[PDB]
């Protein structure tokens, strides 16, 4: 019969690993605040990806050295029987940077370990990086053959380039709350880019900041989907 | 609400 190769092969024995780095408490000398509500995010992600049949590994309060070593070790594993790879980063951040408990780590350093040439058992497979962290300090006021080494990566950023990312101390972050809700409802129905578009809408319409500080009050947020994927991604098969 |  006629065959179409438009979607990633997601019927390998395992869906893959879902590494969640949950950084809540930071070393006093860094001057970084405690990320209240991040445990709600980590727990929501653990349950969401468990139901998607991913082998979830939750890591709490890792130093910059521990983050690099974890990523290196995970990239050196045999992922031949795995369909994909997911890494969720929950921490403080700047543009292109994620914070370890004792200091910064370049996002490029983390993602480079999974390049098509550096992690052979993941070549041609989707590598998803979900990042809940700030990408700067701007506030949104609102209104109304061979394959590339950078191919097959998807970066689901919580916020637009140069902007702050919002996290609620009780409910968790706007992005992760929305991501988990949309994956629970649409993972058995829609393609990943379409699920992420629903997350963009949810964060954009359902949330607005409340603060006694006028500078941080009534602010909005829009996530940023960055795709270097070459095929469509469906969490289901058959 | 807090920022990261």
């Amino acid at each position: 019969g006629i065959s179409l190769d438009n979607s990633y092969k997601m019927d390998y024995p395992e869906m893959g690993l879902c590494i969640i780095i949950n950084n809540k408490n930071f070393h006093k000398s860094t001057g970084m605040t405690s990320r209240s509500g991040t445990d709600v995010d980590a727990a929501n992600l653990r349950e969401t990806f468990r139901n998607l049949k991913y082998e979830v590994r939750n890591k709490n309060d890792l130093t910059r050295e521990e983050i690099v070593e974890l990523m290196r070790d995970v990239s050196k594993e045999d992922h031949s029987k795995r369909s994909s790879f997911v890494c969720v980063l929950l921490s403080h951040g700047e543009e292109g940077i994620i914070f370890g408990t004792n200091g910064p780590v370049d996002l490029k350093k983390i993602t480079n370990f999974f390049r098509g040439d550096r992690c052979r058992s993941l070549t041609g497979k989707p590598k998803l990086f979900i990042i809940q962290a700030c990408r700067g300090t701007e506030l949104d006021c609102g209104i109304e053959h061979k394959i590339p080494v950078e191919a097959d990566f998807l970066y689901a950023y919580s916020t637009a380039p140069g902007y702050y990312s919002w996290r609620n101390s009780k409910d968790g972050s706007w992005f992760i709350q929305s991501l988990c809700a949309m994956l629970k409802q649409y993972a058995d129905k829609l393609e990943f880019m379409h699920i992420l578009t629903r997350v963009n809408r949810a964060v954009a319409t359902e949330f607005e900041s409340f603060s006694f500080d006028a500078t941080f009050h009534a602010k909005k947020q829009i996530p940023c989907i960055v795709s270097m994927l070459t095929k469509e991604l469906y969490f289901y098969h058959h | 609400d807090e920022v990261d």
Side-chain angles (χ1 to χ4, degrees), chain A residues 1-144 146-238, chain B:
Chain A
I2 297 155
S3 53
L4 266 63
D5 208 43
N6 307 135
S7 300
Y8 284 116
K9 184 180 163 64
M10 297 298 283
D11 65 345
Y12 277 90
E14 297 166 37
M15 279 293 274
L17 307 184
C18 176
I19 309 298
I20 301 164
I21 300 177
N22 183 221
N23 282 0
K24 185 173 68 180
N25 304 299
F26 296 76
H27 288 200
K28 196 164 75 163
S29 305
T30 66
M32 305 317 269
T33 54
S34 183
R35 291 182 67 255
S36 305
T38 193
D39 289 343
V40 179
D41 278 0
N44 207 170
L45 285 155
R46 183 175 181 77
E47 181 59 22
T48 301
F49 282 95
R50 176 187 76 90
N51 288 314
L52 290 183
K53 315 303 174 179
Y54 278 89
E55 188 183 319
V56 186
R57 301 186 189 160
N58 277 76
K59 289 301 282 176
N60 303 116
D61 296 334
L62 300 185
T63 61
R64 62 195 299 186
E65 291 87 6
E66 285 173 317
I67 288 178
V68 174
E69 194 61 60
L70 181 69
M71 292 293 108
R72 180 167 34 234
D73 293 344
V74 169
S75 70
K76 289 183 301 195
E77 279 182 32
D78 186 12
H79 301 259
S80 59
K81 287 83 70 189
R82 300 177 188 148
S83 297
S84 59
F85 176 66
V86 179
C87 173
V88 191
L89 299 166
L90 310 174
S91 194
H92 279 298
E94 290 289 352
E95 187 65 63
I97 287 153
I98 191 88
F99 277 79
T101 57
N102 63 335
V105 196
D106 282 345
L107 279 172
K108 283 297 289 183
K109 201 181 194 302
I110 289 160
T111 59
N112 275 352
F113 286 121
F114 302 88
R115 269 168 52 151
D117 61 337
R118 299 180 190 176
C119 184
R120 298 305 306 274
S121 60
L122 277 178
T123 309
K125 298 175 186 180
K127 296 160 275 282
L128 282 39
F129 289 81
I130 294 151
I131 304 131
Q132 170 52 53
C134 287
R135 294 182 74 188
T137 53
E138 290 180 64
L139 286 158
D140 198 307
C141 67
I143 187 62
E144 232 259 74
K146 289 166 67 186
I147 60 136
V149 306
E150 298 278 6
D152 309 305
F153 276 89
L154 183 132
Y155 310 85
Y157 293 101
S158 64
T159 195
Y163 287 76
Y164 273 122
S165 186
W166 291 93
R167 168 186 40 76
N168 184 268
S169 60
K170 179 175 68 184
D171 308 327
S173 73
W174 299 358
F175 178 67
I176 299 300
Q177 277 178 251
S178 301
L179 177 62
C180 291
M182 296 297 111
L183 278 170
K184 284 176 189 170
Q185 194 180 11
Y186 301 111
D188 63 335
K189 300 161 194 169
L190 304 176
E191 196 269 329
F192 196 43
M193 294 294 284
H194 291 172
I195 296 167
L196 287 175
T197 301
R198 299 285 196 119
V199 177
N200 276 6
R201 194 177 186 203
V203 179
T205 60
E206 299 164 28
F207 301 94
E208 192 177 292
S209 75
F210 182 74
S211 180
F212 299 143
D213 188 342
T215 303
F216 290 82
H217 181 59
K219 305 301 176 185
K220 304 290 289 182
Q221 179 177 320
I222 183 75
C224 183
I225 309 154
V226 180
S227 179
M228 259 130 295
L229 295 184
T230 58
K231 288 173 186 177
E232 286 175 21
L233 205 174
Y234 296 89
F235 292 101
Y236 61 98
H237 67 89
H238 221 7
Chain B
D1 296 323
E2 301 181 348
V3 294
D4 282 329

